[PDB]
Write a protein that binds this ligand. Structure first.
Ligand code: 8EM
Ligand code: 8EM
Lengths: 372, 385
C-alpha cells in the first residue's frame, strides 16, 4: 500500500521530466497530489506497530504536508503555462523524497604518529627524477596526516565545529589539496616506473601536479562552511550547497572520477604495461626468480591503492544514488553513515603504506631492472 | 602506373607476404612488387615535376628504388629456395626503405626565436587572467557560473602545456621528455582544447535560453572531449627523423595509407573544433539578436549594450580560431594532391605556429567575455524583461 503510492509519485516524476506541454505536467502533478494525500493516512510496514500520536508520526506526516505544498507550487506554475518552471519545482520533490565510538578517535591518532614517523624517515633518508617524486609524495602525505588530530577532536564532540568558519574553508581545502597531490604523485610514480621498464633513455611536472591539486580543491573552498543542522541542533563544518540533492550527487561523482577512476586507470595500465613487457622476455634461470620479484613490487602499488581507497569510493557512489533517488531504504542508508569514518581512515592509511612501496624498495627496483 | 598507384601495389603485397603460409604465395607477391618498383623508378614525384631528371633530388629517388629492387631480389632468392619465414623477414626490411621514402617524398631550420618568447608571454598572462576568475568566484562565495568554472579550469590546463611546446620548438622539434609524455601530454592538450570549445558552446546556449525565458551536461562535455582526443592517444608517438637526426613527437599514422590519414584527421579538426561549434555560437547570437529587436529612446541604450556583449563572444571565436582552421584545410588539400606548389606549402608551415598561438590566446580573452561581464549581462537582462 505504501510502496504502491510512492511508485505512483516516482512514476509521475519521470513523466514530468519527459513532458513537453504544461497539460502533461499538470496531469502528472494531479495524480501525485492525490497519491500524497492517500499516503499521508497510511502506516508504513516499518512503523506499523507505532502509535499515531507518537513524535515519529508528527514529523513524517508533516513531511507529506511539505510534499503536497511543493506539488501546489508546481501546479500554480503549470496552470500559468510554465513548463520549464513546473519541471524545476519537480526537482525539489526529489530532495523531499530523500529527506523522508571511542575507538574512532584512538584509531585516527595511532595511524597519525606512525604515518608521520615513516614519512619523516623518507624526507630524512632522501636528505634522480624518481627520487624527486618520492620527496613531493612524502611532503603531501606529511601535510595530510597532520590534519588527523583536527578530525579526531571534531568527532570527539560528535560533529561540532569550534575552530571558526574560516578554519572550515582553510583546513577543509588544505585537506583536499594534499589528498589529491598524494594521489596525483602516486600516478607520476607509476608512469615513471613504466617509462623505465620499456626504455632506459621533472621541473615542469611537479608544479603542474600541485596546480591540478589546487584546481581540484576549489569546490571545497567554494562550498565548505559552518552551518546549523536543525535536524540534530548542532554547528557543523559542511558543504553548504544552495537549496541541494543535485549538488551532493554531482560532487560525489566528481570525488570518484578525479580521486579514484582516472588515477586507477593509470596505475592499472602501467602495471599491465610492465607485466606484458617483462613476460615477453622469457627468463629461465635465477632471472625467472628475479622477474617474479620485480612483478611483486609492481603488483603491490596497484593492490595497496584499491585496498585503501575502494571502500570509501564505494560508499560515496552508494551515497550519490541516494540523492538521485535510486536507493531509498533508510536501513541501507544508515549503514553507509556508520561505516563512513572507518572508510575515511583507510585513505589516510595509504600515506603510511607509501614509504614501504616506493622509498624503502627504490634502489632494489632499479638494480633488479638493469639486471633482467 | 602513377607512383601513388604503384606504392598501393607495393604496400598491398607487403600485407599479403605477412598473411601468406606458402613460399609460392610469397614469390607471387614479390614478383608483383619488383615490376611495380621498376615501373615507379621511371616516374617523377608529384612535387619534383619542375626539377630536371639529372638533378641530385631525382638521383636519390631513382637510387631509393634500386635499393628496394635489390631487397626484393634477396627475398626472392629465399622464396625460390623454399624459405617462407626468411623471405617474410626480408620483407620487414622493405618497410624501413618505404618509411625512408615517405619521410622525404610526402626543414627544422625554419626556426624563429620570436615564437618561444610569444608562447611564454601569453602563458603567464592567460594563467593570471584565469586565476583571477577562480579567485573572484572564491571572493563571491548559478548554472551559468558553473560553466565559467569548468571553462576556466580547461583554459588553465591548456595554457599550462605552453612551456612544453615553446621548448620542443626550441630544440628544432627534438622531443626530450619521453615517448609516454608524447601520448600523455599530446592527448591532455586535445582533451582540454575541446573541453574549452565545448564549454564556450554551453555558455552561448545558456545565454540564449535565458534571453528567451545541468549536473548531466558538465560530465558529458568532458566525456565528449575524451572521445574527440582518442585519435591523438592512439597515434601520437616519438619517431626518429634520420634526415635531421631528431626524435620528434608526431602522429604515427600507418605508412600504408599515411596521406589519407593526415587529410582525414585534418578534416575532423575543422568539423569538431570549428564548424559544429561556430554553428551554435552563430545561431545563439542571431537568436538573441532576433529576441531583442522584437518585444525605443531610453530602453534602446540598454538593449544595444546587451547585443554588444553577445557580438563579442562570436567575433572573438572566429578571430582566434579561423586563421588556424583555414591553414588546416589548405594542408588537407596538400595531402590530397590538390595544392602541390612548395612555395604556397612553405607559407602554411611558416604561419602555422602563429595561427596555433591565436588558439591559446582565446583562453586569455575568455575571462573578459564571460566572468568579467557576468553580473552586467544578468542585471541588464532582468531590466529589459
Ligand atoms: C585521506 C582522506 C581524506 C578525507 N579526509 C576526511 C577528513 C574528515 C572528514 N569529515 C568527516 C569526519 C570524519 C571524522 C571526523 O570528521 C569532515 O567532517 C570534514 C570536515 C571539513 C572538511 C572536510 C571533511 C572527511 C574526510 C574525507 O572525506 N576525506 C576524503 C575526501 C576529501 C575531500 C574530497 C573532495 C574532493 C573534491 C571535491 C570536494 C571534496 C570534499 N569533500 N568534502 N569536502 N570537500 C573527497 C574525498
Ligand atoms: C589551443 C591550441 C591547441 C594546439 N596546440 C598545439 C601545440 C603544439 C603543436 N605542435 C606543433 C608545435 C608548435 C610549436 C611547437 O610544436 C606539436 O608538435 C604537437 C606535439 C604533440 C602533440 C600535439 C601537438 C600543435 C598544436 C595544435 O595544433 N593545436 C591545435 C589542435 C590540437 C589538436 C587537434 C586534434 C583534434 C582532433 C584529433 C587530433 C588532433 C591532433 N592534432 N595533432 N595531434 N592530435 C586539433 C587542433
Amino acid at each position: 500500500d505504501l510502496e504502491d503510492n510512492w511508485e505512483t509519485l516516482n512514476d509521475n516524476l519521470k513523466v514530468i521530466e519527459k513532458a513537453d506541454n504544461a497539460a502533461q505536467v499538470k496531469d502528472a502533478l494531479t495524480k501525485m497530489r492525490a497519491a500524497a494525500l492517500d499516503a499521508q493516512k497510511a502506516t508504513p510496514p516499518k512503523l506499523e506497530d507505532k502509535s499515531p500520536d507518537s513524535p515519529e508520526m508528527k514529523d513524517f506526516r508533516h513531511g507529506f504536508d511539505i510534499l503536497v505544498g511543493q506539488i501546489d507550487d508546481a501546479l500554480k506554475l503549470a496552470n500559468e503555462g510554465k513548463v520549464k518552471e513546473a519541471q524545476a519545482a519537480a526537482e525539489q520533490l526529489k530532495t523531499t523524497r530523500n529527506a523522508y565510538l571511542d575507538a574512532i578517535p584512538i584509531l585516527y591518532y595511532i595511524i597519525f604518529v606512525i604515518g608521520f614517523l615513516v614519512n619523516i624517515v623518507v624526507v630524512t633518508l632522501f636528505c634522480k627524477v624518481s627520487s624527486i617524486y618520492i620527496f613531493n609524495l612524502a611532503v603531501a602525505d606529511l601535510l595530510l596526516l597532520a590534519t588527523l588530530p583536527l578530525w579526531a577532536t571534531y568527532y570527539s564532540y560528535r560533529y561540532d565545529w569550534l575552530f571558526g568558519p574560516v578554519m572550515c574553508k582553510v583546513f577543509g581545502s588544505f585537506l583536499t589539496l594534499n589528498m589529491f597531490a598524494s594521489i596525483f604523485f602516486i600516478t607520476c610514480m607509476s608512469v615513471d616506473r613504466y617509462q623505465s621498464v620499456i626504455y632506459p633513455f621533472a621541473s615542469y611536472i611537479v608544479p603542474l601536479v600541485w596546480c591540478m591539486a589546487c584546481l581540484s580543491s576549489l569546490p571545497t573552498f567554494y562550498f565548505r562552511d559552518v552551518r546549523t543542522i536543525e535536524y540534530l541542533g548542532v554547528n557543523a563544518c559542511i558543504m553548504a550547497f544552495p537549496p541541494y540533492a543535485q549538488w551532493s550527487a554531482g560532487i560525489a561523482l566528481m570525488k570518484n572520477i578525479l580521486g579514484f577512476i582516472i588515477p586507477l586507470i593509470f596505475i592499472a595500465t602501467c602495471y599491465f604495461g610492465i607485466r606484458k613487457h617483462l613476460l615477453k622476455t622469457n627468463s629461465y634461470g635465477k632471472n625467472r626468480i628475479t622477474r617474479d620479484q620485480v612483478l611483486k613490487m609492481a603488483a603491490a602499488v596497484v593492490l595497496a591503492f584499491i585496498i585503501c581507497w575502494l571502500p570509501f569510493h564505494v560508499l560515496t557512489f552508494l551515497d550519490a544514488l541516494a540523492w538521485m533517488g535510486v536507493i531509498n531504504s533508510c536501513e541501507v542508508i544508515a549503514v553507509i553513515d556508520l561505516a563512513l569514518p572507518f572508510a575515511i581512515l583507510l585513505g589516510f592509511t595509504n600515506s603510511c603504506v607509501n614509504p614501504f612501496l616506493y622509498c624503502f624498495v627504490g634502489n632494489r627496483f632499479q638494480q633488479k631492472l638493469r639486471s633482467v
